[PDB]
Amino acid sequence: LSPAVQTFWKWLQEEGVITAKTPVKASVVTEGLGLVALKDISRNDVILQVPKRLWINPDAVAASEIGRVCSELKPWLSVILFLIRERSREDSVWKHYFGILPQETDSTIYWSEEELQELQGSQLLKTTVSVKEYVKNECLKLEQEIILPNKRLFPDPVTLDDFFWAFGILRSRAFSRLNLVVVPMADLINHSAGVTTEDHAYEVYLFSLKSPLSVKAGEQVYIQYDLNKSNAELALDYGFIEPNENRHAYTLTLEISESDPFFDDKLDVAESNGFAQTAYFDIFYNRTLPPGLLPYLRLVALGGTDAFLLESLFRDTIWGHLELSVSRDNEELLCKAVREACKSALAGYHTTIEQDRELKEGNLDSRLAIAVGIREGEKMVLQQIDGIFEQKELELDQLEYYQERRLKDLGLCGENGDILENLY
Ligand SMILES: Nc1ncnc2c1ncn2[C@@H]1O[C@H](CSCC[C@H](N)C(=O)O)[C@@H](O)[C@H]1O
Numbered sequence: 001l002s003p004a005v006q007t008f009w010k011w012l013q014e015e016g017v018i019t020a021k022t023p024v025k026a027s028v029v030t031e032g033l034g035l036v037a038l039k040d041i042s043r044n045d046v047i048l049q050v051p052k053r054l055w056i057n058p059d060a061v062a063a064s065e066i067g068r069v070c071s072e073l074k075p076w077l078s079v080i081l082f083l084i085r086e087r088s089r090e091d092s093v094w095k096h097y098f099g100i101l102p103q104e105t106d107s108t109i110y111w112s113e114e115e116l117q118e119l120q121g122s123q124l125l126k127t128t129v130s131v132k133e134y135v136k137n138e139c140l141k142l143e144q145e146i147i148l149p150n151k152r153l154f155p156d157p158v159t160l161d162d163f164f165w166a167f168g169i170l171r172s173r174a175f176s177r178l179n180l181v182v183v184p185m186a187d188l189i190n191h192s193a194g195v196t197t198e199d200h201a202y203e204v205y206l207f208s209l210k211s212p213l214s215v216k217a218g219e220q221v222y223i224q225y226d227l228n229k230s231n232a233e234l235a236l237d238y239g240f241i242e243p244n245e246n247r248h249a250y251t252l253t254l255e256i257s258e259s260d261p262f263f264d265d266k267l268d269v270a271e272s273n274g275f276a277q278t279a280y281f282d283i284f285y286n287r288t289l290p291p292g293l294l295p296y297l298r299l300v301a302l303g304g305t306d307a308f309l310l311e312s313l314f315r316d317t318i319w320g321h322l323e324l325s326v327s328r329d330n331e332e333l334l335c336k337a338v339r340e341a342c343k344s345a346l347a348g349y350h351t352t353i354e355q356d357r358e359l360k361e362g363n364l365d366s367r368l369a370i371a372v373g374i375r376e377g378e379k380m381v382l383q384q385i386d387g388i389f390e391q392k393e394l395e396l397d398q399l400e401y402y403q404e405r406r407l408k409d410l411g412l413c414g415e416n417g418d419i420l421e422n423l424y
């Protein structure tokens with residue numbers, strides 16, 4: 001099979017992890033390394049359990065020689081260093097383990113500059129930069145503040161590469177479902193759209209892993225990494241995406257600018273209803289607009305004319321009105337703004353959806369395939385959003401704004417009220 005692999009298995013055997021009780025051998029699959037069922041496994045069947053003696057979370061780093069120095073360090077930062085450190089030591093308890101870990105994945109955090117050009121104009125590109133940058137800073141402060149001072153615990157130099165390496169390992173191997181644990185045995189389980197549950201972790205401490213699906217002898221055992229992540233998210237966290245167009249999403253960012261003459265009043269209204277000065281609305285393909293998006297858009301484009309709704313008089317129904325619409329000038333404004341943002345964003349890509357779809361029709365490199373699928377999806381969402389507001393511009397007169405809703409109770413045609421009045 002593989003050097004460190006055929007050995008890594010041996011390692012677990014003595015640690016009382018892998019026995020003739022566990023029906024699942026590690027194998028080389030299209031997704032790298034994975035768990036192949038050694039024999040017909042059933043639903044919920046615990047495939048393998050690992051002794052907490054083998055975890056690699058904050059609790060294990062706090063108990064090692066670097067447990068002190070990393071005392072005030074944040075959760076991940078502690079594990080980053082720990083992982084790096086153990087990778088160096090030739091007598092580490094995870095010796096056969098690290099010889100198994102992939103030096104890299106297809107996460108965009110590793111993409112070359114050319115590779116990154118394939119995501120030009122994409123939201124994913126932005127996000128990946130930000131993340132790469134941040135991690136960098138936090139990793140440089142660790143060197144200058146922990147790695148270098150304690151030249152006794154960290155003998156070897158630590159490069160950025162090693163950092164991103166450890167980070168990636170975290171982002172693609174941590175089970176934050178119990179918040180940042182790692183399990184050398186159940187670390188080799190891959191993701192599959194076949195699984196639609198999203199609950200496999202367990203603990204009897206101990207880490208118990210159970211296959212949410214009945215696998216036959218020879219086949220691979222999978223799990224659902226996260227039913228709620230977008231493709232842009234699966235792309236960064238792990239190095240893969242799904243064909244499922246329902247994973248395509250595009251998040252819009254809304255904010256009440258401080259230069260807005262009604263900033264103070266608008267922010268009070270927003271906060272009073274669960275929204276901050278800045279708000280993110282995730283828009284998924286074929287899914288309906290998120291609640292709050294429209295009323296927040298209306299608040300943003302409020303304007304002098306409708307500013308009267310910001311008065312103490314409505315501080316109890318203003319949001320209800322925002323949900324029902326303010327006025328035609330208000331609706332037209334936000335539509336205009338949204339459509340313009342969509343068209344502007346659409347122009348930022350270097351390929352058309354037609355080209356992307358044709359590309360997908362041939363054989364693509366894993367990272368090329370990700371960029372293509374990611375950018376095609378984003379264009380679909382942007383165009384769906386644009387489609388939605390284009391319709392809105394047309395039905396701009398079918399909505400019953402504030403004024404009209406206010407006059408829907410005039411009772412013009414009532415009684416000859418004067419008769420009653422002239423009776424006293
Ligand atoms: N469905 C899938 N398609 C492609 N790669 C996958 C995948 N599920 C898991 N992976 C890969 O495996 C990582 C999760 S850790 C799983 C073990 C991994 N196969 C290994 O050889 O070490 C992901 O970040 C990704 O690079």
Ligand SMILES: C[N+](C)(C)CCCC[C@H](N)C(=O)O
Pocket residue numbers: 172173174175176177186187188189190201225
């Ligand atoms: C790749 N590996 C299987 C190790 C983890 C995949 C992500 C699991 C997710 N954090 C959850 O706990 O629900």
